[PDB]
Design an enzyme around this catalytic site. Sequence first.
Site, PDB file in Angstrom:
ATOM      1  N   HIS A  37      17.870  37.951   8.738  1.00  0.00           N
ATOM      2  CA  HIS A  37      17.249  39.186   8.244  1.00  0.00           C
ATOM      3  C   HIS A  37      18.262  40.081   7.525  1.00  0.00           C
ATOM      4  O   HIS A  37      17.904  40.740   6.551  1.00  0.00           O
ATOM      5  CB  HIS A  37      16.589  39.961   9.396  1.00  0.00           C
ATOM      6  N   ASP A 149      22.401  38.087  23.523  1.00  0.00           N
ATOM      7  CA  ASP A 149      21.633  37.020  22.889  1.00  0.00           C
ATOM      8  C   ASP A 149      22.291  35.635  23.019  1.00  0.00           C
ATOM      9  O   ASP A 149      22.310  34.843  22.064  1.00  0.00           O
ATOM     10  CB  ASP A 149      21.206  37.375  21.443  1.00  0.00           C
ATOM     11  N   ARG A 153      21.191  28.120  20.342  1.00  0.00           N
ATOM     12  CA  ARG A 153      20.995  28.376  18.904  1.00  0.00           C
ATOM     13  C   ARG A 153      22.062  29.366  18.358  1.00  0.00           C
ATOM     14  O   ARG A 153      22.258  29.446  17.137  1.00  0.00           O
ATOM     15  CB  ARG A 153      19.581  28.953  18.652  1.00  0.00           C
ATOM     16  N   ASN A 154      22.724  30.124  19.266  1.00  0.00           N
ATOM     17  CA  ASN A 154      23.701  31.168  18.922  1.00  0.00           C
ATOM     18  C   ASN A 154      25.141  30.780  19.140  1.00  0.00           C
ATOM     19  O   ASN A 154      26.034  31.614  18.970  1.00  0.00           O
ATOM     20  CB  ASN A 154      23.334  32.496  19.580  1.00  0.00           C
ATOM     21  N   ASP A 167      27.085  34.592  16.772  1.00  0.00           N
ATOM     22  CA  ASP A 167      26.045  35.620  16.679  1.00  0.00           C
ATOM     23  C   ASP A 167      26.445  36.978  17.317  1.00  0.00           C
ATOM     24  O   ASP A 167      25.766  37.474  18.214  1.00  0.00           O
ATOM     25  CB  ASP A 167      24.715  35.087  17.245  1.00  0.00           C
TER      26      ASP A 167
HETATM   27  C1  LIG Z   1      19.788  27.768  13.420  1.00  0.00           C
HETATM   28  N1  LIG Z   1      20.966  28.528  13.066  1.00  0.00           N
HETATM   29  C2  LIG Z   1      21.796  29.253  13.889  1.00  0.00           C
HETATM   30  C3  LIG Z   1      22.755  29.802  13.082  1.00  0.00           C
HETATM   31  C4  LIG Z   1      23.849  30.696  13.486  1.00  0.00           C
HETATM   32  C5  LIG Z   1      24.017  31.126  14.844  1.00  0.00           C
HETATM   33  C6  LIG Z   1      25.027  31.995  15.183  1.00  0.00           C
HETATM   34  C7  LIG Z   1      25.897  32.454  14.162  1.00  0.00           C
HETATM   35  N2  LIG Z   1      26.941  33.269  14.153  1.00  0.00           N
HETATM   36  C8  LIG Z   1      27.364  33.309  12.829  1.00  0.00           C
HETATM   37  C9  LIG Z   1      26.570  32.535  12.028  1.00  0.00           C
HETATM   38  C10 LIG Z   1      26.654  32.266  10.558  1.00  0.00           C
HETATM   39  C11 LIG Z   1      27.252  30.895  10.274  1.00  0.00           C
HETATM   40  C12 LIG Z   1      28.636  30.643  10.469  1.00  0.00           C
HETATM   41  C13 LIG Z   1      29.180  29.367  10.184  1.00  0.00           C
HETATM   42  C14 LIG Z   1      28.367  28.334   9.655  1.00  0.00           C
HETATM   43  N3  LIG Z   1      28.917  27.119   9.372  1.00  0.00           N
HETATM   44  C15 LIG Z   1      28.108  26.127   8.925  1.00  0.00           C
HETATM   45  C16 LIG Z   1      26.713  26.283   8.733  1.00  0.00           C
HETATM   46  C17 LIG Z   1      26.135  27.547   9.005  1.00  0.00           C
HETATM   47  C18 LIG Z   1      26.965  28.594   9.463  1.00  0.00           C
HETATM   48  C19 LIG Z   1      26.409  29.863   9.779  1.00  0.00           C
HETATM   49  N4  LIG Z   1      25.626  31.970  12.862  1.00  0.00           N
HETATM   50  N5  LIG Z   1      24.641  31.104  12.478  1.00  0.00           N
HETATM   51  C20 LIG Z   1      22.400  29.407  11.762  1.00  0.00           C
HETATM   52  N6  LIG Z   1      21.339  28.613  11.769  1.00  0.00           N
END
Ligand SMILES: Cn1cc(-c2ccc3ncc(Cc4ccc5ncccc5c4)n3n2)cn1
Length: 292
Positions: A37, A149, A153-154, A167
Site C-alpha cells: 500500500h 506483525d 509472510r513477513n 516488515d
Molecule cells: C508476499 N510478500 C511478502 C513480502 C515482504 C515481506 C516483508 C518485507 N520486508 C521488506 C520487504 C520488501 C522486500 C525486500 C527484499 C526483497 N527481495 C526479493 C524480493 C522481494 C523483496 C521485498 N518485505 N516484503 C513481499 N511479498
Amino acid sequence: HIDLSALNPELVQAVQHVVIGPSSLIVHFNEVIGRGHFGCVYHGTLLDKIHCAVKSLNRITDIGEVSQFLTEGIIMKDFSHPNVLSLLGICLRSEGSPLVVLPYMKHGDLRNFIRNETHNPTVKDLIGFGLQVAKGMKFLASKKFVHRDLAARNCMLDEKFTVKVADFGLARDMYDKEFLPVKWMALESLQTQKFTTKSDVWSFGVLLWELMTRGAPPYPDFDITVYLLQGRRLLQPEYCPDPLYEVMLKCWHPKAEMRPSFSELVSRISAIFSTFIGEHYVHVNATYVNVK
Ligand SMILES: Cn1cc(-c2ccc3ncc(Cc4ccc5ncccc5c4)n3n2)cn1
Ligand SMILES: [Cl-]
C-alpha cells in the site's frame, strides 16, 4: 518534487552513513518484486555490483517529512543483526518519492518458500528456520522493539537460506494483498488492542505452526476470540515433533507473563534442532492444499 536544497547541512552530515547517492543506485522500475500500500518494491543495482530491493515510499511528499524519514533510517540501520532485514540506505531524489534500499532476498518470503512444492524441506530445515526467526526476535526484543506483525509472510529468505525478520521500520507494509492479522494475535491483543514482546511470542508460536505445516493458513474452518475462549489452540502438525508442539503451547499461554522470552525460545529450539540430522522429509497436508 522534494526541495532537497532546504535539507539541513549538519543533519546531512549526521544521516551520511544512511544516505546513498543517486549515481550509486540503478533502479529497474520495469521489474516489480514486491507490492504494498505504501509503494512497490523493484529490482535494484547498488554500486560499491550489489543486487538490492528498492522501495519507493509514497508517504513522503514534502521536505518537512524528510528529516523524520531520515531519522527512521538511522533507527532502522541500527537494527543490524544476521536474522533481521538490514537497511543498506536511503536514496533522496529531486524528482519522485524517496527510495528505501534493502538487501535482495533471493528466495523471497518464508511462507511462499515453504509452500513451494519444488522445495524438499526436512524437519531439521523447518526447525532451523524457526530458530533463526527466534534469534532475530531475541535481538529485536533486546532493543525493546515490538513487531506486532510477526508471521511467515513477513520473514524473508536470502541466497544462503538465512531467515531475516522483516516488515518493520521504513519497509513496514501489507505485502499480502489477500489481507487486523487476528489469526496471529495474542488473546489480550484481540481484546485490548495493546501489543508487547509477549504478544510477539504468541505470533511466533503461530509462525512455528506455519513452518511445520509448510505454510498452511492457521485455523482453516469467524470470531477468533470466541473460538480461542472455547478452550482451543491450533492442532499439532503431522510432522511437528512433540517438544516443539509443547513450545508452541507455551507461546500461547493465556497469561502473557507466563510465555517464554525469545531468549528461552532460542535456547529450547536450539536443543530440539540439534537432535535432528535432516532425514525426516516434511510433506504437504492433503486437507491444507489450495485452502485460501
Ligand atoms: C508476499 N510478500 C511478502 C513480502 C515482504 C515481506 C516483508 C518485507 N520486508 C521488506 C520487504 C520488501 C522486500 C525486500 C527484499 C526483497 N527481495 C526479493 C524480493 C522481494 C523483496 C521485498 N518485505 N516484503 C513481499 N511479498
Ligand atoms: Cl530431519
